[PDB]
Design a protein around this nucleic acid. Sequence first.
RNA 1: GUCCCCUUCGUCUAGAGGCCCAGGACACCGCCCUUUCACGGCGGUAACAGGGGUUCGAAUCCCCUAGGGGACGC
Length: 364
Amino acid sequence: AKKVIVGMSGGVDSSVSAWLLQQQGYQVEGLFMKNWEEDDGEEYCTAAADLADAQAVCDKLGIELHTVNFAAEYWDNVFELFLAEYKAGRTPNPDILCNKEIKFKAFLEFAAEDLGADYIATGHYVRRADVDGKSRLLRGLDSNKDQSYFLYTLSHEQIAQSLFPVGELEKPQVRKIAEDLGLVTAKKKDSTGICFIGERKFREFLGRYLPAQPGKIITVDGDEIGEHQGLMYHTLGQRKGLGIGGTKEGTEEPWYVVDKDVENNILVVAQGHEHPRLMSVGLIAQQLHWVDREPFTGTMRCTVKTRYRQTDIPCTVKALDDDRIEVIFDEPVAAVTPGQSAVFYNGEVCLGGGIIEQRLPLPV
RNA sequence: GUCCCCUUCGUCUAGAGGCCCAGGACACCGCCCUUUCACGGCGGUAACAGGGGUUCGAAUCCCCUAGGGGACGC
């Protein structure tokens, strides 16, 4: 009967997730983090009441709900670096650190230093399986819907001390168990947007943390075409917001981004969700993390994603340094964007990924 | 001033008297999808430069005013 502090978010998942441990035996207490100081009000309530939903489930379950405010560190170790790499015309995955710096550190820490427990549990639809003495990470069932990608930063240690209940179920079940128990959360917007921050519309959110200087938009044929109004507002393979409306000698295809020109403040577009300047045969990842937490030397042979919910695309990996890696896409990959993370899997297992900083241009 | 061609949704256009209260594409807007940003799916809004004629009927035919052509536009 160990102590288990589950992160109550007021989300359908979490809820079912606690009740599952509760049943599973465990002493179950839940904590609700408040990590973002909303500027607006329409935003507050939304996340304020998101708490009453959280609590009202702990009560209907008979569990104490703990308040905490890591908002301090959220900005400190996440949203800050967030805006950083963005300013640098790259696409960062806030959420990807939202787990590395908080939900599995900041939290985990405060679990025993205060709450005094010996098992943290998120509702992350992923699973944990210990073997040969090393705690291993691995995506749950319901393949389609799964979050292994967001936790490549975790280590066996961290994982081991964590509990992932629902990752065993299948999404429809979860969203139901809750409906049956009566948990107020069942029937609630699965959730979107930066973790902790609201599902608001980007352009207005990002355009409130950085400047706003227009520019020019060029075809892949070094010729004017559109008004680049802004730049951080886009990303390789983006389609919307490029004003373009086809012209005389255009395949009617929609236009997609292909490269940001940092200094010349350009916006190299093209045309066709398959155009050569939107594919690669590999890339190079830096800031690496292996759940295994073993040093990586030599050559590997696995699969790899390059954006959330992408699709296990075969690849070969070889060490290019003590921090960088050179992977080679078994087939061209679409819009490998720099800044996003690249998680490699060895099947059921998720070996952990790393940050992309270099794609591998398609041969002419 | 050489007495001939032009003009369609935001944009690129379909349209050669009744089938067009105008069609597609891209854009734009929305929903769905999704704990990043994106992709994707689905659907919606939207135009005959303007005024007269001719026909049972006109986007298309004629006429009238605001944009482009004639190796001489001395």
